Each structure stands twice: as structure tokens, then as C-alpha cells.
Design a protein around this nucleic acid. Structure first.
Ligand SMILES: Nc1ncnc2c1ncn2[C@H]1C[C@H](O)[C@@H](COP(=O)(O)NP(=O)(O)OP(=O)(O)O)O1
Ligand SMILES: [Mg+2]
Ligand SMILES: [Mg+2]
Ligand code: NA
Ligand code: NA
Length: 327
DNA sequence: CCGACATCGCATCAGC
DNA sequence: GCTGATGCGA
DNA sequence: GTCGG
């Protein structure tokens, strides 16, 4: 449905969502507000009353009232007030820095630190993730065009095969679904010598090579199975340098790779749909495995999976190209 | 009336 | 020192 | 905040 159809309402609900997470520390009210924002933004009619919207799953009494006040006054008093609030609005803002959550932001604002400049003055009070978050605050809220993503995929698949040609890597996320832009790069990785019933060196060697050719520039976190960091395309000729980008690389056992690929390909709402279909079918799907329920409710052993399609077959669903997995 | 609401790897903190 | 908890991003 | 056992 069109943007400014009920855009005024969904912006209201998303604002309310973020204050719940970042200021009130009420994570379930956060998800609640977003569930309503989502179900309304897909509703193909301009909403006339709070009662009209209350018919949608996720829209209860309190949001129905808020919609009324909005439709009648063009604003929400509680939201207007909380926007005015110097403490609460500063807390909400600081959480836009990756590494700073609802709790850290609460602390900074307590001891007087409210803005980016305040963060820049106080580097010694920040940890490694947060410094990188501050350093790339602007870049991180930018989107990545598919053309850049393709160029990034080139570098990654190249350097990975160059380390060891038996590696298997797949760029998942929205990129794999064909999207015209992406928020980050989600890379999945496996090797024929790494399974469930089974070398930690496998992930480290890939990160290292990518740092060598200077594709990876910073590191947020890194273990034996998951890498979170920053990456940048090399800049061409004398043209303006590319934004720094968020990139994830995680090493998955060969056994669990395609449950991994399928899950991390998304979309979000496709996953929950395909998890519940799926449920009436007597199977249970997580990111690792698919297991059979289970005549009382016991899970049997993990079932063998050697492609995405296998998992589609178990639950008797027609395989669907990542292109169509928007839900 | 009252609990569930997605889930997990990693960094750092709190406590011993 | 170690172990578990907590915060964080996704 | 919403839904439902
Ligand atoms: N809450 C959730 N429930 C089910 N799957 C989820 C999930 N959160 C993440 N995933 C799975 C499904 C997601 O598709 C996949 C990648 O996570 P992202 O990179 O955070 N989201 P995407 O890459 O699609 O879009 P973009 O990055 O351009 O903003 O991880
Ligand atoms: Mg992504
Ligand atoms: Mg991601
Ligand atoms: Na409802
Ligand atoms: Na943040």
C-alpha cells in the first residue's frame, strides 16, 4: 500500500515504539507497537477511526484510542511532550550509536553526556564497539545499493576461494532476495571439514585475508563462529570515497548450512510464516535444523539437509526463489 | 487475571 | 584468576 | 500493549 496512506499513523507508532525500547526499557511494548505499525502499513485503505483499525491483529484498545486523538488533532499529546523532554529525547538519540543501547544511553545522559559532541569529548568512557559506532555514525545509517553489494560480493567470494578453494560462501540477507538496496552484508560460510559431530582456524583465516587486501577495516566482535565488523570498497581513480559498511561473517557446520542459508536469507516475515506451516505439518524449524514432531511433542533427531529445497520438501512446500520470499 | 511475546554469539561487567 | 550475568546487535 | 489460556 502507498506510503502516505496511513503513514502519519505508522510514524506515530514507530516513534512510540522506539521510546518504549530506548527510554522505558519495555522491549515487549516495543515489538507490540511495531507489530501494529506493520499490520497497518499493509492495510490497503485509509483508516477512518480507531475502531476501524482495532479489527487488525496487533491493534488493541490503547492504540485505537491514540489513532482517534491523532485523526482528530493531527498529533498525540504524550508524543509531543516526550519529544520536548530533554532527558528522554537525548536518551533515545544516543541509542542510534551502534554499541550504545538503552542502558548505556541512560548512563551517559545521567552524567551529563547527551550529544555526539559530548561522546566525542568523552572517548575514554566508551568501549571498542561504541567508538567504531561513533566513528561511523553517519555511514552506518546509509543504505547500500545493489551495485555496490555486487562489487562487495566479488571481493568476498574471491578472497574466500583464494584462502581455500574448498570453502563455500553465500551472501544472504536482502541482497540474496534481489533487493535494490541493503542495510548490511550477511555472509554465511562453511567447509567440508567442519560439521556437527566434529578447526577454529577456519573463520579467522577468512577475516585475515579480507583484512590483508584491506576490504575489512574495523572489528566489532569476533569468535570461532561469528564475525561482526566494518568493510569498505577501494576507491576508484580520484573519486569520492565509499561509505564504510556493516558486514557479518559466520561459520556454519556443513550439516546445518542450508537451514542457515534459508533462515539468514529471510525475509523476517517469511521465516515466521514458513516456521508455522511447517508447524501444522509436524516439523520444527530453527536456524540450525529441521526436526520432526513428534507424536506427543518430542523432537526426533535432526533430519539430513543437502539443499534449501530439501527443507521445502519435508514440509511439502513448492520451492520458492529467494526473489519471492518477501513473506 | 496474568503470562508470553525470537533467538543467540560475543564483549564486558559483577561477583566470588 | 574463573564463572555467570548482563548488555548489545541482529 | 496485545492476545489468549
Ligand atoms: N527477528 C527475526 N526473525 C526471523 N528471522 C530474522 C529475524 N531477524 C533477522 N532474521 C534473519 C532474516 C533476515 O532476512 C536475515 C538477515 O538479517 P538482516 O540483515 O537484519 N535483515 P535483511 O538482511 O533481510 O535486510 P537488511 O539487512 O537490508 O536491512 O536474518
Ligand atoms: Mg542484511
Ligand atoms: Mg544482518
Ligand atoms: Na484487535
Ligand atoms: Na545503538
Amino acid at each position: 500500500p502507498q506510503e502516505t496512506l496511513n503513514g502519519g499513523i505508522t510514524d506515530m507508532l514507530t516513534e512510540l515504539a522506539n521510546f518504549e525500547k530506548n527510554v522505558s526499557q519495555a522491549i515487549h511494548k516495543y515489538n507490540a507497537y511495531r507489530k501494529a505499525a506493520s499490520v497497518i502499513a499493509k492495510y490497503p485503505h485509509k483508516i477512518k477511526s480507531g475502531a476501524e483499525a482495532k479489527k487488525l491483529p496487533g491493534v488493541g484498545t490503547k492504540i485505537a484510542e491514540k489513532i482517534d486523538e491523532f485523526l482528530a488533532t493531527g498529533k498525540l499529546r504524550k508524543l509531543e511532550k516526550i519529544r520536548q523532554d530533554d532527558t528522554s529525547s537525548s536518551i533515545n538519540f544516543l541509542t542510534r550509536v551502534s554499541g550504545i543501547g538503552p542502558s548505556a544511553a541512560r548512563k551517559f545522559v545521567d552524567e551529563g553526556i547527551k550529544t555526539l559532541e559530548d561522546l566525542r569529548k568523552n572517548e575514554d568512557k566508551l568501549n571498542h564497539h561504541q567508538r567504531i559506532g561513533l566513528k561511523y555514525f553517519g555511514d552506518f545509517e546509509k543504505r547500500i545499493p545493489r551495485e555496490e553489494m555486487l562489487q562487495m560480493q566479488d571481493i568476498v567470494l574471491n578472497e574466500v576461494k583464494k584462502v581455500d578453494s574448498e570453502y563455500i560462501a553465500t551472501v544472504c540477507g536482502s541482497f540474496r532476495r534481489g533487493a535494490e538496496s541493503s542495510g548490511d552484508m550477511d555472509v554465511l560460510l562453511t567447509h567440508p571439514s567442519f560439521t556437527s559431530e566434529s578447526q577454529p582456524k577456519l573463520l579467522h583465516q577468512v577475516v585475515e585475508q579480507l583484512q590483508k587486501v584491506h576490504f575489512i577495516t574495523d572489528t566489532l566482535s569476533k569468535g570461532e563462529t561469528k564475525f561482526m565488523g566494518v568493510c569498505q570498497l577501494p576507491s576508484k581513480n580520484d573519486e569520492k570515497e565509499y561509505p564504510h559498511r556493516r558486514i557479518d561473517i559466520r561459520l556454519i557446520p556443513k550439516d546445518q548450512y542450508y537451514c542457515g542459508v534459508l533462515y539468514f536469507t529471510g525475509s523476517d516475515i517469511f521465516n515466521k510464516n514458513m516456521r508455522a506451516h511447517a508447524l501444522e505439518k509436524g516439523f520444527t524449524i530453527n536456524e540450525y535444523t529441521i526436526r520432526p514432531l513428534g507424536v506427543t511433542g518430542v523432537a526426533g533427531e535432526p533430519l539430513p539437509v543437502d539443499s534449501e529445497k530439501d527443507i521445502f520438501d519435508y514440509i511439502q512446500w513448492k520451492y520458492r526463489e529467494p526473489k519471492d520470499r518477501s513473506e
